[PDB]
Design a protein around this motif. Structure first.
Motif, PDB file in Angstrom:
ATOM      1  N   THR A   1       0.821  -1.200   0.024  1.00  0.00           N
ATOM      2  CA  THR A   1       0.047  -0.202   0.026  1.00  0.00           C
ATOM      3  C   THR A   1       0.691   1.226  -0.001  1.00  0.00           C
ATOM      4  OG1 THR A   1      -1.815  -1.306   1.369  1.00  0.00           O
ATOM      5  CG2 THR A   1      -2.052   1.111   1.157  1.00  0.00           C
ATOM      6  N   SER A   2       0.127   2.239  -0.822  1.00  0.00           N
ATOM      7  CA  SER A   2       1.193   3.503  -0.860  1.00  0.00           C
ATOM      8  C   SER A   2       1.322   4.136   0.642  1.00  0.00           C
ATOM      9  CB  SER A   2       0.520   4.375  -1.781  1.00  0.00           C
ATOM     10  OG  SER A   2      -0.373   5.208  -1.123  1.00  0.00           O
ATOM     11  N   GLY A   3       0.441   3.938   1.521  1.00  0.00           N
ATOM     12  CA  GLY A   3       0.400   4.486   2.971  1.00  0.00           C
ATOM     13  C   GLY A   3       1.593   3.888   3.582  1.00  0.00           C
ATOM     14  N   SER A   4       1.718   2.522   3.572  1.00  0.00           N
ATOM     15  CA  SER A   4       3.037   2.062   4.297  1.00  0.00           C
ATOM     16  C   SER A   4       4.224   2.141   3.740  1.00  0.00           C
ATOM     17  CB  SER A   4       2.708   0.233   4.231  1.00  0.00           C
ATOM     18  OG  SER A   4       3.251  -0.197   2.845  1.00  0.00           O
ATOM     19  N   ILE A   5       4.453   2.390   2.518  1.00  0.00           N
ATOM     20  CA  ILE A   5       5.711   3.062   1.865  1.00  0.00           C
ATOM     21  C   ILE A   5       6.007   4.364   2.174  1.00  0.00           C
ATOM     22  CG2 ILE A   5       6.838   3.138  -0.338  1.00  0.00           C
ATOM     23  CD1 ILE A   5       5.139   1.016  -1.756  1.00  0.00           C
ATOM     24  N   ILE A   6       5.053   5.206   2.139  1.00  0.00           N
ATOM     25  CA  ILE A   6       5.306   6.525   2.599  1.00  0.00           C
ATOM     26  C   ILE A   6       5.617   6.511   4.109  1.00  0.00           C
ATOM     27  CG2 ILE A   6       4.193   8.860   3.013  1.00  0.00           C
ATOM     28  CD1 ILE A   6       2.625   8.051   0.495  1.00  0.00           C
ATOM     29  N   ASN A   7       5.068   5.849   4.910  1.00  0.00           N
ATOM     30  CA  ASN A   7       5.427   5.740   6.382  1.00  0.00           C
ATOM     31  C   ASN A   7       6.714   5.179   6.679  1.00  0.00           C
ATOM     32  OD1 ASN A   7       4.766   5.608   9.253  1.00  0.00           O
ATOM     33  ND2 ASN A   7       4.601   3.631   8.762  1.00  0.00           N
ATOM     34  N   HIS A   8       6.970   4.126   5.842  1.00  0.00           N
ATOM     35  CA  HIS A   8       8.368   3.835   6.114  1.00  0.00           C
ATOM     36  C   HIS A   8       9.333   4.644   5.567  1.00  0.00           C
ATOM     37  CE1 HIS A   8      11.244   0.369   6.560  1.00  0.00           C
ATOM     38  NE2 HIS A   8      11.937   0.706   5.504  1.00  0.00           N
ATOM     39  N   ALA A   9       9.254   5.313   4.520  1.00  0.00           N
ATOM     40  CA  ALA A   9      10.322   6.094   4.033  1.00  0.00           C
ATOM     41  C   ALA A   9      10.592   7.313   4.999  1.00  0.00           C
ATOM     42  CB  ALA A   9       9.932   6.748   2.633  1.00  0.00           C
ATOM     43  N   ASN A  10       9.453   7.801   5.442  1.00  0.00           N
ATOM     44  CA  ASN A  10       9.687   9.114   6.305  1.00  0.00           C
ATOM     45  C   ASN A  10      10.198   8.937   7.953  1.00  0.00           C
ATOM     46  OD1 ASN A  10       8.420  10.761   4.394  1.00  0.00           O
ATOM     47  ND2 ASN A  10       6.357  10.558   5.186  1.00  0.00           N
ATOM     48  N   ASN A  11       9.725   7.528   8.211  1.00  0.00           N
ATOM     49  CA  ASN A  11      10.336   6.968   9.467  1.00  0.00           C
ATOM     50  C   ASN A  11      11.584   6.769   9.421  1.00  0.00           C
ATOM     51  OD1 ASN A  11       7.857   7.486  10.516  1.00  0.00           O
ATOM     52  ND2 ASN A  11       7.280   5.383  11.052  1.00  0.00           N
ATOM     53  N   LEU A  12      12.043   6.219   8.252  1.00  0.00           N
ATOM     54  CA  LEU A  12      13.592   5.926   8.051  1.00  0.00           C
ATOM     55  C   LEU A  12      14.474   7.131   8.080  1.00  0.00           C
ATOM     56  CD1 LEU A  12      15.405   2.964   7.184  1.00  0.00           C
ATOM     57  CD2 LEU A  12      15.114   4.269   4.951  1.00  0.00           C
ATOM     58  N   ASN A  13      13.997   8.059   7.224  1.00  0.00           N
ATOM     59  CA  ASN A  13      14.744   9.317   7.267  1.00  0.00           C
ATOM     60  C   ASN A  13      14.953  10.072   8.306  1.00  0.00           C
ATOM     61  OD1 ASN A  13      15.151   8.701   4.600  1.00  0.00           O
ATOM     62  ND2 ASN A  13      13.473  10.474   3.963  1.00  0.00           N
ATOM     63  N   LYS A  14      13.842   9.787   9.278  1.00  0.00           N
ATOM     64  CA  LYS A  14      14.074  10.564  10.655  1.00  0.00           C
ATOM     65  C   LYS A  14      14.909   9.937  11.535  1.00  0.00           C
ATOM     66  CE  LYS A  14       9.959  13.426  10.960  1.00  0.00           C
ATOM     67  NZ  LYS A  14      10.525  14.097   9.909  1.00  0.00           N
ATOM     68  N   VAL A  15      15.166   8.653  11.430  1.00  0.00           N
ATOM     69  CA  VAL A  15      15.905   7.830  12.172  1.00  0.00           C
ATOM     70  C   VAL A  15      17.158   8.076  11.634  1.00  0.00           C
ATOM     71  CG1 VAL A  15      16.932   5.461  12.558  1.00  0.00           C
ATOM     72  CG2 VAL A  15      14.517   5.826  13.074  1.00  0.00           C
ATOM     73  N   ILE A  16      17.504   8.091  10.455  1.00  0.00           N
ATOM     74  CA  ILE A  16      18.861   8.626  10.087  1.00  0.00           C
ATOM     75  C   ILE A  16      19.418   9.943  10.530  1.00  0.00           C
ATOM     76  CG2 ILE A  16      20.401   8.680   7.830  1.00  0.00           C
ATOM     77  CD1 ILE A  16      19.602   5.993   8.709  1.00  0.00           C
ATOM     78  N   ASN A  17      18.540  10.893  10.311  1.00  0.00           N
ATOM     79  CA  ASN A  17      19.067  12.243  10.581  1.00  0.00           C
ATOM     80  C   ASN A  17      19.178  12.247  12.092  1.00  0.00           C
ATOM     81  OD1 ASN A  17      18.391  12.829   8.022  1.00  0.00           O
ATOM     82  ND2 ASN A  17      16.931  14.491   8.314  1.00  0.00           N
ATOM     83  N   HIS A  18      18.514  11.556  13.141  1.00  0.00           N
ATOM     84  CA  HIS A  18      18.823  11.737  14.396  1.00  0.00           C
ATOM     85  C   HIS A  18      19.940  10.668  14.832  1.00  0.00           C
ATOM     86  CE1 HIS A  18      17.486  12.131  18.728  1.00  0.00           C
ATOM     87  NE2 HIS A  18      18.199  10.864  18.701  1.00  0.00           N
ATOM     88  N   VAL A  19      20.413   9.749  14.100  1.00  0.00           N
ATOM     89  CA  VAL A  19      21.308   8.990  14.360  1.00  0.00           C
ATOM     90  C   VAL A  19      22.776   9.434  14.108  1.00  0.00           C
ATOM     91  CG1 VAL A  19      22.729   6.988  13.411  1.00  0.00           C
ATOM     92  CG2 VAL A  19      20.435   6.623  14.431  1.00  0.00           C
ATOM     93  N   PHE A  20      22.484  10.345  12.838  1.00  0.00           N
ATOM     94  CA  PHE A  20      23.833  10.963  12.482  1.00  0.00           C
ATOM     95  C   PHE A  20      24.139  12.265  13.000  1.00  0.00           C
ATOM     96  CE2 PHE A  20      26.303   8.409   9.509  1.00  0.00           C
ATOM     97  CZ  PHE A  20      25.536   7.281   9.040  1.00  0.00           C
ATOM     98  N   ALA A  21      23.150  12.985  13.972  1.00  0.00           N
ATOM     99  CA  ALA A  21      23.329  14.157  14.140  1.00  0.00           C
ATOM    100  C   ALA A  21      24.297  14.049  15.528  1.00  0.00           C
ATOM    101  CB  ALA A  21      21.999  14.611  14.896  1.00  0.00           C
ATOM    102  N   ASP A  22      24.861  15.129  15.772  1.00  0.00           N
ATOM    103  CA  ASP A  22      25.714  15.264  17.370  1.00  0.00           C
ATOM    104  C   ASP A  22      26.828  14.195  16.897  1.00  0.00           C
ATOM    105  OD1 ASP A  22      24.259  17.364  17.794  1.00  0.00           O
ATOM    106  OD2 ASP A  22      22.994  16.058  19.227  1.00  0.00           O
ATOM    107  N   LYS A  23      27.320  13.325  17.915  1.00  0.00           N
ATOM    108  CA  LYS A  23      28.144  12.219  17.807  1.00  0.00           C
ATOM    109  C   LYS A  23      27.450  11.158  17.161  1.00  0.00           C
ATOM    110  CE  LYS A  23      30.018   9.448  20.822  1.00  0.00           C
ATOM    111  NZ  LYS A  23      29.993   8.403  19.931  1.00  0.00           N
ATOM    112  N   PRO A  24      27.936  10.729  15.772  1.00  0.00           N
ATOM    113  CA  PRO A  24      27.266   9.756  15.270  1.00  0.00           C
ATOM    114  C   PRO A  24      27.156   8.333  16.078  1.00  0.00           C
ATOM    115  CG  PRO A  24      29.212  10.517  13.907  1.00  0.00           C
ATOM    116  CD  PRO A  24      29.198  11.215  15.285  1.00  0.00           C
ATOM    117  N   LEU A  25      26.101   7.551  15.730  1.00  0.00           N
ATOM    118  CA  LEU A  25      25.994   6.415  16.705  1.00  0.00           C
ATOM    119  C   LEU A  25      26.754   5.184  16.132  1.00  0.00           C
ATOM    120  CD1 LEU A  25      24.235   4.074  18.611  1.00  0.00           C
ATOM    121  CD2 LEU A  25      22.895   3.978  16.242  1.00  0.00           C
TER     122      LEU A  25
END
Lengths: 50, 51
Positions: A1-25
């Motif tokens: 479903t297009s909703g699941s793909i959009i939800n996965h893409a947005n959540n994944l970008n939020k995780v990557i941005n937070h993980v690489f912010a400040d000291k990277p994980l």
């Protein structure tokens, strides 16, 4: 479903941005492995998480 | 330290939930003007002698 793909893409970008912010994980050793092909560190980690 | 990063990432995903939407319903509505006078379009024609 297009909703699941959009939800996965947005959540994944939020995780990557937070993980690489400040000291990277993730240490620089794993970044070297994931950037051997040529992709950037953020992109290489993103595909591995998927 | 790396646990705070993992916990922070999860909280970011959980906070991405949407609450509601807000909008105005104005379609179909038009302003009203006020006409102050009634058009009659009448004239009285009378002869000079009044007959």
């Amino acid at each position: 479903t297009s909703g699941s793909i959009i939800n996965h893409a947005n959540n994944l970008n939020k995780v990557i941005n937070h993980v690489f912010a400040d000291k990277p994980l993730i240490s620089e050793t794993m970044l070297k492995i994931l950037t051997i092909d040529g992709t950037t560190g953020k992109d290489g980690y993103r595909n591995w998480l998927d | 330290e790396d646990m705070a990063k993992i916990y922070g990432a999860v909280a970011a995903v959980s906070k991405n939930v949407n609450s509601s939407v807000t909008y105005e319903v104005k379609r179909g509505t038009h302003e009203l003007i006020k006409v102050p006078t009634i058009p009659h379009n009448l004239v009285l024609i009378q002869s000079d002698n009044g007959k």
